[PDB]
Amino acid sequence: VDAGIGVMGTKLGMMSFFEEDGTVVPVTVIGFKEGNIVTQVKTESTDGYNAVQVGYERLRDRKLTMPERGHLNKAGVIPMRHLQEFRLVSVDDFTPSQKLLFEELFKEGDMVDISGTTIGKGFQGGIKRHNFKRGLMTHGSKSHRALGSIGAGTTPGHVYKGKKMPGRMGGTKTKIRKLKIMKIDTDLRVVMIKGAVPGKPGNLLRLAPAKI
Amino acid sequence: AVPKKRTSIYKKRIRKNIWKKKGYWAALKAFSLAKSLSTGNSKSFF
Amino acid sequence: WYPKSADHVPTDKKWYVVDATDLILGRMASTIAIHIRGKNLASYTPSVDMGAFVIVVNADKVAVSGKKRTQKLYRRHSGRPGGLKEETFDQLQKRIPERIIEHAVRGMLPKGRLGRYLFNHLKVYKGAEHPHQAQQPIDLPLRDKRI
Amino acid sequence: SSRPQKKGTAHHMKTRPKKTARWDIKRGPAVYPPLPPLPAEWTIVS
RNA sequence: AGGGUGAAAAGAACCCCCAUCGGGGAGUGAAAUAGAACAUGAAACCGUAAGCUCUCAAGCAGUGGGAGGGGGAACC
RNA sequence: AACCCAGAGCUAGCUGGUUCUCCCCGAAAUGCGUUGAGGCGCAGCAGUUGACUGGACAUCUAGGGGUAAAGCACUGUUUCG
RNA sequence: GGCCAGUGAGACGAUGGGGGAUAAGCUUCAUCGUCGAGAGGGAAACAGCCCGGAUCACCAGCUAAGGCCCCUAAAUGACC
RNA sequence: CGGUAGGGGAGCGUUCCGUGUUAGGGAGAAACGCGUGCGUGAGCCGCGUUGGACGAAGCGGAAGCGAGAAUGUCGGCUUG
RNA sequence: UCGGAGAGAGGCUCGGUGAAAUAGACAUGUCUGUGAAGAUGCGGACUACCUGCACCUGGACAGAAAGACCCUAUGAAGCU
RNA sequence: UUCACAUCGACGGGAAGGUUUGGCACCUCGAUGUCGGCUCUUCGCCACCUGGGGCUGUAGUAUGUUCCAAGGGUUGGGCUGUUCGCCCAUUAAAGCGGUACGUGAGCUGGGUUCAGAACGUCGUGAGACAGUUCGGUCCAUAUCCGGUGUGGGCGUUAGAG
RNA sequence: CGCUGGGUAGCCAAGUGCGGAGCGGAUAACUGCUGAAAGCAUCUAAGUAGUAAGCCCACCCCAAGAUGAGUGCUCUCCUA
């Protein structure tokens, strides 16, 4: 569930916005390759919950399968690469046909929480995934940076599960909460959103008001 | 570091089969390269 | 000569129904799992699944005597340490009701490959209507004076 | 502490099934009517 | 440590694949699926083909009961 | 306190090993002595064979003992007047 | 008596005791039981507790110790 | 008619010898298997193959005589 | 403190050659309980599709050497 | 101050724990690798600190004690090989434990149980002291269960996004 | 890469941004409200109120191999 419907943009680098007061604040910059359009709305009766399915990044028909283009076509909308729905407190008042929305809204809700696929760091070790420590680098020591011990002796008789081994670190989406919006420019349809948001510039970036 | 006990014939056949089969998948690729190298427009194999 | 052996029985197994509105949990679950096994059939055989589907309805209103309703706790333990999950019967019957009976019979009947296979023969529903009219389920016989 | 525990063999005498209600100890099986005898079961006479 | 083609080398003319390694015919021999790392050829171990079968499983893995199916038409 | 060969298959009351079928009977882990007590000798308890036997089990009656319990005559302690 | 063995630190349970701390699945002796050398059923599993003693076959029956709601046989049987 | 240590009784089997240059045997001696044939059992009769040369039974005799246990041992093979 | 980035050789994947110690057979779960008294092999409950590859090493009283500490042997040897 | 129980509780008694020192010696001598640190756990409470409460010889601020509470937290150093053995500076506090005195097929080897040597002492002597002192190569390319990641087949009963 | 200065991207931090919430429901200790057993009283026996970093939902990330394998809006072909 989320508080309200949200949009999804794209990370576009960062910069600073000199506040006229003369204080320096970092910002990132959110952009829309193609505009968010509703492409579905599901009720509590016809389906199990309530949500609106928005889409992003319009693309050529080739790039996209037949089940997709049929799904998009049924609602009478343009193509679109990315496609996600916001489950919404069951108050939906949306015609699933191309209610192109906008940021007439986030400037009022001056705190926004976004969902971004972080960047991916391969198969990282113990010392960095889980913030372990490391043995002495000198003094005859011979186990630096290694995961060290695992468990106890005969009784536990194995390694408690959920142990903090090494493994793959990044690549899964993450929120970031109560991150406040900041002076926006509708001619360029760009957002100047303070803070630092998941992902190197150019990944999809859900964007929806808080759930305080 | 040292194995306890020899594996069965059962298990070993399983893994050898995975080895060979891993060779199976990498033929039909070469067969595509063949069935394409039979004279045709292409920029490869001077 | 030779005792008869359960020879192939597929479907047309009797569907029964039990409205569990205030029927104490244990005793009911014994007479459910005795029709789940087939010990009411001269065709009884432990190794084959001669049983009969049944349907519990009103799975929210099973009664339990004594002070159970706040004492009995269902605990599911995660494999890792600290995973033990104290959980009292009132919280389940409030939260997910069908799991109650889904435990009761699941302890009654013989775990194994076969027991696991049969446990599907219990369909539990928290509403007051059951979507099965499969064999037009004839209500379930209770030989228990105390329920 | 200060109390010992009851182990194998010792544990058994405390905790084996005893039929400790004078009544059921007493009882005896049904007897029957004497069932007057039964014929032969085989005959060459044919 | 390393023995035993055949009774007689009659130890393989000729042909084809052919870097002359090794083979398939042809030929010899009673027989060469006896052909020269050749006489009977067991077991471990390596394959192949056919018959039935395993992916919600729990087991010193067999045993008593035997569902279903395949075999020559009650036994495996 | 070399190495090879020989006495030498040294010795080991110590460890390990001791393969085909069936049938009948079938123990002990106690005492004694032992430079002896994770050995051995004798007894004690198996097998099998030959004598002489008389029982074994239950019942009852005799005979001596100082144990359980009791007692303060004995010995030793023991409180109140 | 003859010809010949093996055995020589047993264990627990019950009892009467010593040692111990009327502690030990401790130790040490006396009288019995089971295991040792003995299966089977009850005891959830479980030498040393209970019934009981295994020549074999039987897709026959009656019981002992123990038991009769389900998993497993057998009354969710009577009355206080 | 349970049975370990152990004692006694009755047997099978293998290589070789006496009866033999035996009976039988290039229409074919042994290793592999179909026969729950047969035995209380060790094992025995039959039954088959590319090869293929010897050799039973009975009454007897002798033993380099019966194996999964020795961190045995010689050879061939695996697991990783 | 408090780590971090980098280059090289390994690791990793593909082509070629190709060992090892270990190994009763393993169809090789967790918790508790039991048990020669610290079990994947027994009991109850939970949990878990089959099978790969990389990575760590808590168990399999993991491998290695019939312990080198302790004791025994009417053992061996050295020194006084 | 009076007042047994705000607080301490003499004299004696009844328990639970299992971690100290021990008693037995049951498994393990064809081997179950010890103390202390490093890294990483996880669990218990009878609670040190944070959450709530009684009673107080609680005016308030501090407390003292008990009650429910393990969700969390539970420093940096100097000395010693040496977990309340300890002074320094803080800090909300700077807990006690179990996990083969957790963890050596993960690490160091400062100590102890190796061969050298010396001091005190015992022994006439070889040598010796659960006295001291200086030096003294702690081996490993995971078969299986376990765990962290990630795949493939196959199940999902037409096939797929 | 000889040794040095300087450095974009990347990866890092001693840099920067944010985060531990109106939360809501049951509770333990405790304080209660009405009130007899017991013609007073008592938080309790009937019934109800408040209330803890503790429990559950909420928060954030996976998740239908959840074999109980869910859901729906699109596709894909009935010529043998």
From Swiss-Prot, chain A:
Q: Which domain of life is it from?
A: Eukaryota
Q: Which family would the database say this protein is a member of?
A: Belongs to the universal ribosomal protein uL3 family.
Subunit comment:
Component of the chloroplast large ribosomal subunit (LSU). Mature 70S chloroplast ribosomes of higher plants consist of a small (30S) and a large (50S) subunit. The 30S small subunit contains 1 molecule of ribosomal RNA (16S rRNA) and 24 different proteins. The 50S large subunit contains 3 rRNA molecules (23S, 5S and 4.5S rRNA) and 33 different proteins.
What stretch of the complete protein does the chain hold? 86 to 297 of 305
Keyword Ribonucleoprotein on this protein? Answer: yes
**Sequence segments annotated as region (Disordered):** 143-171
Q: Which UniProt keywords apply?
A: Chloroplast, Plastid, Ribonucleoprotein, Ribosomal protein, RNA-binding, rRNA-binding, Transit peptide
User: Where does this one sit in the cell?
Assistant: Plastid, Chloroplast
Function summary: Component of the chloroplast ribosome (chloro-ribosome), a dedicated translation machinery responsible for the synthesis of chloroplast genome-encoded proteins, including proteins of the transcription and translation machinery and components of the photosynthetic apparatus.
Which species is the source of this protein? Spinacia oleracea (Spinach)
GO CC terms for this protein? chloroplast envelope; ribonucleoprotein complex; ribosome
| Sample GO molecular function, one term | rRNA binding
Q: What is this protein called?
A: Large ribosomal subunit protein uL3c
| Keyword RNA-binding annotated | yes
Q: List, in alphabetical order, the GO biological process terms annotated in this UniProt record.
A: translation
From Swiss-Prot, chain B:
Task: Please state where this protein is localized.
Answer: Plastid, Chloroplast
Q: Which terms under GO biological process does the entry name?
A: translation
GO CC entries: chloroplast; large ribosomal subunit
Please state the span of the N-terminal signal peptide per the UniProt entry. Answer: none
Keyword terms, alphabetized: Chloroplast, Plastid, Ribonucleoprotein, Ribosomal protein
Q: What is its main location?
A: plastid
GO MF terms here are: structural constituent of ribosome
Q: Which family does it belong to?
A: Belongs to the bacterial ribosomal protein bL32 family.
Q: Outline what the protein does.
A: Component of the chloroplast ribosome (chloro-ribosome), a dedicated translation machinery responsible for the synthesis of chloroplast genome-encoded proteins, including proteins of the transcription and translation machinery and components of the photosynthetic apparatus.
Q: How does it assemble?
A: Component of the chloroplast large ribosomal subunit (LSU). Mature 70S chloroplast ribosomes of higher plants consist of a small (30S) and a large (50S) subunit. The 30S small subunit contains 1 molecule of ribosomal RNA (16S rRNA) and 24 different proteins. The 50S large subunit contains 3 rRNA molecules (23S, 5S and 4.5S rRNA) and 33 different proteins.
Instruction: Please report the name of this protein according to its UniProt entry.
Output: Large ribosomal subunit protein bL32c
The species this protein was found in = Spinacia oleracea (Spinach)
> What taxonomic classification does the UniProt entry list for its organism?
Eukaryota, Viridiplantae, Streptophyta, Embryophyta, Tracheophyta
UniProtKB/Swiss-Prot annotation, chain C:
Spell out the subcellular localization from the entry.
Plastid, Chloroplast
UniProt GO MF annotations: mRNA binding; structural constituent of ribosome
Give the UniProt record's GO annotations in the biological process aspect: negative regulation of translation; translation
Keyword entries, A-Z: Chloroplast, Plastid, Ribonucleoprotein, Ribosomal protein, Transit peptide
Keyword Transcription on entry: no
GO cellular component, alphabetical, reads: chloroplast; cytosolic large ribosomal subunit; ribosome
| Protein origin, superkingdom | Eukaryota
Q: Which cysteines are joined by disulfide bonds?
A: none
The UniProt entry's sequence similarity note says: Belongs to the universal ribosomal protein uL13 family.
Complexes and interactors: Component of the chloroplast large ribosomal subunit (LSU). Mature 70S chloroplast ribosomes of higher plants consist of a small (30S) and a large (50S) subunit. The 30S small subunit contains 1 molecule of ribosomal RNA (16S rRNA) and 24 different proteins. The 50S large subunit contains 3 rRNA molecules (23S, 5S and 4.5S rRNA) and 33 different proteins.
Tell me the function of this protein. Component of the chloroplast ribosome (chloro-ribosome), a dedicated translation machinery responsible for the synthesis of chloroplast genome-encoded proteins, including proteins of the transcription and translation machinery and components of the photosynthetic apparatus.
Q: What name does this protein carry? A: Large ribosomal subunit protein uL13c
Curated annotation (Swiss-Prot), chain D:
Which family, according to UniProt? Belongs to the chloroplast-specific ribosomal protein cL38 family.
Put simply, this protein is called Large ribosomal subunit protein cL38
Q: What does this protein do?
A: Component of the chloroplast ribosome (chloro-ribosome), a dedicated translation machinery responsible for the synthesis of chloroplast genome-encoded proteins, including proteins of the transcription and translation machinery and components of the photosynthetic apparatus.
Task: Describe the protein's quaternary organization and the partners it interacts with.
Answer: Component of the chloroplast large ribosomal subunit (LSU). Mature 70S chloroplast ribosomes of higher plants consist of a small (30S) and a large (50S) subunit. The 30S small subunit contains 1 molecule of ribosomal RNA (16S rRNA) and 24 different proteins. The 50S large subunit contains 3 rRNA molecules (23S, 5S and 4.5S rRNA) and 33 different proteins.
Which species does the entry assign this protein to? Spinacia oleracea
Q: Where in the cell is it found?
A: Plastid, Chloroplast
